[PDB]
Amino acid sequence: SLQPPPQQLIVQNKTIDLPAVYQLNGGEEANPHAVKVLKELLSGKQSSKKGMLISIGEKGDKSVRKYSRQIPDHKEGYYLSVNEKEIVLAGNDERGTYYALQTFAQLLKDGKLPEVEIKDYPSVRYRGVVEGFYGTPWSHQARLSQLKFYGKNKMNTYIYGPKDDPYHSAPNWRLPYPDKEAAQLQELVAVANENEVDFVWAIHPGQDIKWNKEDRDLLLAKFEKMYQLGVRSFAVFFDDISGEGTNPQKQAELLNYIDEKFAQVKPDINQLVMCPTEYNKSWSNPNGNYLTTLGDKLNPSIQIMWTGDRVISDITRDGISWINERIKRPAYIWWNFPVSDYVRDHLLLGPVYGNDTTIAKEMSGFVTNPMEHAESSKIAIYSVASYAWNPAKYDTWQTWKDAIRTILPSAAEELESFAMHNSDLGPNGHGYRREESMDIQPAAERFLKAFKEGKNYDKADFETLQYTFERMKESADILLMNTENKPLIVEITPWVHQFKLTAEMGEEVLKMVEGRNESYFLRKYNHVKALQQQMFYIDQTSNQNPCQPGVKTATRVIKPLIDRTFATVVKFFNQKFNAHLDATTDYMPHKMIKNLPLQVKANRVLISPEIELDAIYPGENIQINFEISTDGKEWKTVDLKQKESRLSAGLQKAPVKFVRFTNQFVLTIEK
Ligand SMILES: CC(=O)N[C@H]1/C(=N/OC(=O)Nc2ccccc2)O[C@H](CO)[C@@H](O)[C@@H]1O
Numbered sequence: 132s133l134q135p136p137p138q139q140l141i142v143q144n145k146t147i148d149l150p151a152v153y154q155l156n157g158g159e160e161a162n163p164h165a166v167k168v169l170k171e172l173l174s175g176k177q178s179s180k181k182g183m184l185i186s187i188g189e190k191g192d193k194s195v196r197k198y199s200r201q202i203p204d205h206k207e208g209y210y211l212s213v214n215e216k217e218i219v220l221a222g223n224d225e226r227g228t229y230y231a232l233q234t235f236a237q238l239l240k241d242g243k244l245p246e247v248e249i250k251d252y253p254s255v256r257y258r259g260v261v262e263g264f265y266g267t268p269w270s271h272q273a274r275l276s277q278l279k280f281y282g283k284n285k286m287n288t289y290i291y292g293p294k295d296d297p298y299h300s301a302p303n304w305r306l307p308y309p310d311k312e313a314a315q316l317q318e319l320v321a322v323a324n325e326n327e328v329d330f331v332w333a334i335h336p337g338q339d340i341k342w343n344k345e346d347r348d349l350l351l352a353k354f355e356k357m358y359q360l361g362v363r364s365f366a367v368f369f370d371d372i373s374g375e376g377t378n379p380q381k382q383a384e385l386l387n388y389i390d391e392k393f394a395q396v397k398p399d400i401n402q403l404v405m406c407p408t409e410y411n412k413s414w415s416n417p418n419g420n421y422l423t424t425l426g427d428k429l430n431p432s433i434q435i436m437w438t439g440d441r442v443i444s445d446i447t448r449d450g451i452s453w454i455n456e457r458i459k460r461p462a463y464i465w466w467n468f469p470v471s472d473y474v475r476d477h478l479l480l481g482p483v484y485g486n487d488t489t490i491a492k493e494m495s496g497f498v499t500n501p502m503e504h505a506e507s508s509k510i511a512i513y514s515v516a517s518y519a520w521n522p523a524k525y526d527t528w529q530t531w532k533d534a535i536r537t538i539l540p541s542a543a544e545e546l547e548s549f550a551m552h553n554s555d556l557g558p559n560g561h562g563y564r565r566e567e568s569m570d571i572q573p574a575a576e577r578f579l580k581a582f583k584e585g586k587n588y589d590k591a592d593f594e595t596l597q598y599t600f601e602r603m604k605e606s607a608d609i610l611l612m613n614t615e616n617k618p619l620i621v622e623i624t625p626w627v628h629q630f631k632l633t634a635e636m637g638e639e640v641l642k643m644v645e646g647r648n649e650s651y652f653l654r655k656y657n658h659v660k661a662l663q664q665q666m667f668y669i670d671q672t673s674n675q676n677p678c679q680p681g682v683k684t685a686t687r688v689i690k691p692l693i694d695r696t697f698a699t700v701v702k703f704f705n706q707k708f709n710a711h712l713d714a715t716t717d718y719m720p721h722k723m724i725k726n727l728p729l730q731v732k733a734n735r736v737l738i739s740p741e742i743e744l745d746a747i748y749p750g751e752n753i754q755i756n757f758e759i760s761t762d763g764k765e766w767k768t769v770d771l772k773q774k775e776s777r778l779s780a781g782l783q784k785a786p787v788k789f790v791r792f793t794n795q796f797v798l799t800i801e802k
C-alpha cells in the first residue's frame with residue numbers, strides 16, 4: 132500500500148530483482164538528498180559500467196534526457212519506472228526526485244521490485260504540520276524524529292510555533308534565542324533541509340506589539356537572526372490576542388513591510404505566512420470588515436491561515452468558499468486535529484476524516500496542529516500527508532491502519548486495539564467529537580437495553596464484550612513492554628494502565644451478571660470497588676497538567692457500559708437479597724450530605740456543575756458561584772466577597788475537614 136497514493140500508477144504483476152550489478156546514471160547531477168537514499172538501498176550491490184541501468188535526475192540533467200516527456204509538469208512531480216532492463220527516477224525538480232525515491236523505497240520488498248510505471252505530484256502545494264499548541268513544546272529529539280517522518284510521507288512544511296515558547300511569543304519574542312536553543316534550531320533546519328521540509332519559524336508578537344518603528348525593527352532583527360541560523364520561511368501569528376495588535380490595517384502593513392524589506396531582499400526565502408486574529412467563521416465579525424481588509428491590503432504572495440467554520444472543524448466546500456471570497460486567495464488551512472490542549476486527559480488516536488476531498492484547488496496549504504505527544508500524533512500526521520497529497524483517493528480507514536503498521540510494526544494489532552477505544556474527546560467547549568468503539572457499540576447497546584428493562588440478552592453479545600475486554604488486556608500488556616518505539620510507549624503508558632484497569636473492571640462486572648451465588652457476587656463486587664480506587668489513583672497521579680489533569684480512556688462507549696451495568700446489577704442484588712450495596716461507579720474519598728458527585732482535581736475539591744474530607748488539610752480558598760469546621764462540632768463562619776456572581780474568600784491555612792452552607796463550588800487545600 133503506497134502512501135500517499137500516487138496520482139497515476141500502472142502495475143504489471145511481474146517482479147524484478149534489485150540489480151546485484153547495476154550502473155548508476157546521474158549520481159553527480161541529481162538531488163544529493165535523493166542519491167543518498169538511493170545508495171543506501173543499493174549498498175552491498177556492485178556499481179559497474181555494464182549492469183542494469185538506473186537513471187536518476189531532475190528535468191534538465193543529462194541523465195534523464197530520454198524521459199523528458201514522462202516527467203509531469205508540476206511542482207514536486209516525478210516519474211518512476213521499473214521494468215526488465217532499466218529503472219528511472221526522474222523529478223520535475225530536486226524535491227520531485229527525492230519524492231521519487233520515497234515511493235521507490237516502499238516498492239522495494241524482500242529485495243524484489245514490481246514492474247511499474249508511476250507519474251505523481253501533489254494536489255496541495257504546502258502540506259505538513261504546525262506545532263502551534265498550548266502546553267509542553269515538543270522535545271528536540273521528538274522534532275528530529277518528526278522531520279524524518281515528514282520526508283518519508285512527502286510533507287514539505289513544518290511550522291514552528293509552540294504557544295509556550297517564550298522566544299516565540301510573549302514577552303521575549305524580541306530576544307534572540309540563547310546559544311543552546313539556537314544551536315538546536317540550527318540542527319533542526321539542517322535536518323529539515325535533508326528531508327526536503329521547509330522549516331517555517333513563526334512569531335507571535337501581537338499581544339504587546341506597539342505599532343511604532345521600535346518593535347517593527349526588533350521583529351525584523353529577530354527574523355534576521357533566525358535567517359542566520361538557516362531559516363528560510365517565516366510566519367507571523369496574530370491569533371488569541373486582544374488590544375491594538377488586532378488591527379487588520381496594521382497587520383497587513385507589517386507583513387507587506389516584511390515582504391518588501393526582507394523576503395524580497397533575500398535570495399532564497401520561500402514561504403511567508405500570517406495567521407489572522409479572526410481565523411474561523413464563527414468568531415469573525417459580521418458587522419466589521421476584518422477579513423476583507425486583510426484580503427485587499429495583504430500582498431498576493433502572502434498566505435493567510437484559517438481553521439474552518441469553527442476553531443475545531445472539518446473543512447467543507449461551502450466553508451472554504453466563504454473564506455476565499457473575503458481574503459481574495461486560497462486559504463492556508465490550519466486544522467486543529469489531533470491537538471488536545473483543551474482536553475489534555477484524552478489521547479486522540481482515531482482516523483482523520485470529515486474534510487471534503489474535492490477542494491484541493493481551493494486551498495493553498497493544509498497543516499495539522501498535533502498533540503503535545505509527538506509520536507502519538509504520527510497516526511493523524513501520516514493520514515493528513517496522504518489526504519493532502521492525493522485527496523481524490525484518500526481512504527480514511529485504510530490510511531489509519533497503514534499509519535499504525537508504520538509506527539509500530541511489531542505490535543500493530545495491539546496498537547490498533549488501543550487506538551480504536553481512544554478516539555473521542557469527551558464533552559468540551561468546542562462541541563467537537565469523534566467516533567470511538569464503533570464495532571462493539573451495537574452489541575453493547577443491545578446488551579444494556581435488554582438488561583435494564585428485564586428482557587433477555589443475546590449470549591453472542593455477551594461473549595463479544597468478554598472478547599473485547601480480554602483483547603484489551605492483551606494489548607495493554609504487550610504495548611507496555613514494547614521496545615520498538617520507546618518514545619511512543621512513554622507517551623501512552625498512563626493511558627495504557629487506565630486502559631487495562633477498564634478491561635479488568637469490565638470482566639469482573641460481567642461475572643457479576645452471570646451471578647451464580649451470593650458470596651461469589653460479593654467477591655466480584657469487592658474486586659470492582661478496588662479497581663475503581665486504582666483508577667482514581669492513576670487519575671490523580673498521572674498526567675497532572677494544570678488544565679485537564681488525569682487520564683481518561685474508552686470514554687464514549689465502554690466506560691459508560693461498564694458503569695451502567697454495574698449500577699444496574701447492584702440494584703437488582705439489593706432488591707433480591709434486601710441489601711444496601713453502594714452503586715456508585717467513581718471512587719471518591721470525600722463525602723457530601725445532592726446526586727452531584729464530588730471531583731478531585733489537583734488540590735481542589737469541587738461539586739459537579741455539607742462536605743467532609745478524608746482528613747484535615749490547611750485551607751487555601753473557596754470559590755462559589757451563585758462556614759467551616761475541623762471536627763463537625765465547632766464551626767468558624769467566614770465571609771465572602773463578590774464581583775459578577777464570583778464569590779470567594781481565603782482560609783489562610785486554617786485546618787479544615789468540614790464545609791457547610793445554607794440560606795462553581797470549589798475548595799482549594801494545601802498539598
Ligand atoms: C489558530 C489556533 O488554533 N490557535 C490556538 C487555538 N485557539 O483556540 C482557542 O481555544 N481560542 C481561544 C479560546 C478561548 C479564548 C481565546 C482564544 O486552538 C488550538 C486548539 O485549542 C490551539 O492549539 C491553537 O494554538
Ligand SMILES: *CCC(=O)Nc1nc(N2CCOCC2)c2ccsc2n1
Nearest residue numbers: 265266371372472473676677678679
Ligand atoms: C491549564 C492551562 C491552560 O488552560 N492553558 C491554555 N490556555 C489557552 N489560552 C490562554 C491565552 O488566551 C487564549 C486561551 C488555550 C487556548 C486553546 S487551548 C489553551 N490552553
Ligand SMILES: [Ca+2]
Nearest residue numbers: 160161189192
Ligand atoms: Ca540536477
